[PDB]
Amino acid sequence: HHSAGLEVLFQGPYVQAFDSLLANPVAEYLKMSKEIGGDVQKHAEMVHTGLKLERALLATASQCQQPAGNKLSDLLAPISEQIQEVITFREKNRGSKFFNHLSAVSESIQALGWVALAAKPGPFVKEMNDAAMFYTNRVLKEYRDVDKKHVDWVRAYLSIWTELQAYIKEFHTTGLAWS
Amino acid sequence: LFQGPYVQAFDSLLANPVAEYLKMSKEIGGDVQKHAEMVHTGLKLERALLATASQCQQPAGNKLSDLLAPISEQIQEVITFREKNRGSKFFNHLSAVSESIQALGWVALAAKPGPFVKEMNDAAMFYTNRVLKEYRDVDKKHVDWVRAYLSIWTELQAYIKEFHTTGLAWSKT
């Protein structure tokens, strides 16, 4: 029937593989972000939308021929706007009580842009996760023996990019496999 | 970073209704703010699918459903929020959104997308009329919220009529 509209659909193989690797880190990161609240919670919602746009692009690639140099930026404009949204939130909230949490995310979120690389996407995400780790090391120093929910937040966030590296390694090693 | 023709034409029509809806929802807060963030996410996936349609040759059956699977998940997330928040002080605001959000599913139809979105707008209108009955003469922010939300689907219909009147136009090459 038409009144029901678009029913829930099963994800194709590219996204199924992505979800099996990234579901548990993403869920834990979203749980701990809600527990911390404030700016950490607001930022996680933006990261979660970035991840949802990551899956939408993987689905595109599984059914689409890689377009011309210029024509690809038209496909990546939705994910690059979301990456910038996550970055400008940190830039506008420099007075935040959770600045290092905001910095860990803004300085690593560009990892979602691995889909724009035709060579070495894995080392790119490793370098992004090294930047997240610098700021998360500060969160650990401040909260390791004060608030354990911040310690799990750090571990949960960093494993998103560790699990993204495992996904790229298994399926898209030499770059996102376009149709 | 810069948007393609399909999405730029969408933004020309939907940027101001969407912004107004998000600002009013934040003013109301609570469950209305929570729901609007889910609607904004759905609208972002809509744009992503319009960018896919501009550069991609139309897929058949299962290949097409694989493309639509991200947005279908988000539409359902908007719908399950209302079904799980029946004890809400903003139940009609919640109902207005969940009974109309399937308008984002127009991208799946092979014919007549406008009357489909119109029917979703009729459902939004039934419940927004209950928000108006209740909150006009109480708080005019709810009146501005209704006007903002209904105009999203009014401007969507103008986008469909102008560019994708017989169905979503996919790339021919």
Residue numbers in the entry:
A (entry chain D): 29 to 207
B (entry chain A): 37 to 209
Please give the exact wording used by the authors of the publication that reports this structure.
It is conserved in evolution from protozoan parasites through yeasts and plants to animals, and is thus among the small number (<10) of core actin-binding proteins present in all eukaryotes. CAP is a relatively large multidomain protein, which can self-assemble into oligomers, most likely hexamers. Here, we reveal that CAP promotes rapid actin filament disassembly by accelerating pointed end depolymerization of cofilin-decorated actin filaments.
The N-terminal HFD domain of CAP is critical for actin filament disassembly in vitro and in cells. Interestingly, the dimeric HFD domain was able to strongly accelerate actin filament depolymerization at much lower concentration when compared to the monomeric HFD domain. These data demonstrate that the HFD domain is the functionally minimal unit for actin filament pointed end depolymerization, and that its oligomerization decreases the effective protein concentration needed for this activity.
